[PDB]
Amino acid sequence: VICDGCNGPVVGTRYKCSVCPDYDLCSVCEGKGLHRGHTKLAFP
Ligand SMILES: [Zn+2]
Ligand SMILES: [Zn+2]
């Protein structure tokens, strides 16, 4: 899984947007508030 924020890996917790098709964030990008205006699921 590739982070749509930074093009890096999504290892550990994956943050998947519940609105967009196929939009995933890594924990660094999530913690920096990228794509914060949509509800996401965080799963281990
Ligand atoms: Zn990232
Ligand atoms: Zn989204």
Residue numbers in the entry: 126 to 169
From the paper:
Intriguingly, it was recently reported that the central ZZ-domain in p62 plays a critical role in the recognition of N-terminal arginylated BiP/GRP78 by the Arg-tRNA transferase ATE1. Here, we present the high resolution structures of the ZZ-domain of p62 in complex with 8 different N-degrons including type-1 and type-2, and subsequently identify key determinants involved in the unusual recognition.
The N-terminal U-shaped loop of the ZZ-domain is maintained by Cys128 and Cys131 residues coordinating to a zinc atom. One side of the protein surface is covered by a highly negatively charged patch formed by four key residues (Asp129, Asn132, Asp147, and Asp149), which is more narrow and shallow compared to previously determined structures of N-recognins (UBR box). These four residues are highly conserved among p62 proteins, but not in other ZZ-domain proteins. Therefore, two zinc atoms are critical for not only stable folding of the ZZ-domain, but also for proper location of the key residues involved in recognizing N-degrons. Since structures of the ZZ-domain have been determined for both the apo and R-BiP complex states, we investigated the possibility of conformational changes in the ZZ-domain of p62 upon complex formation.
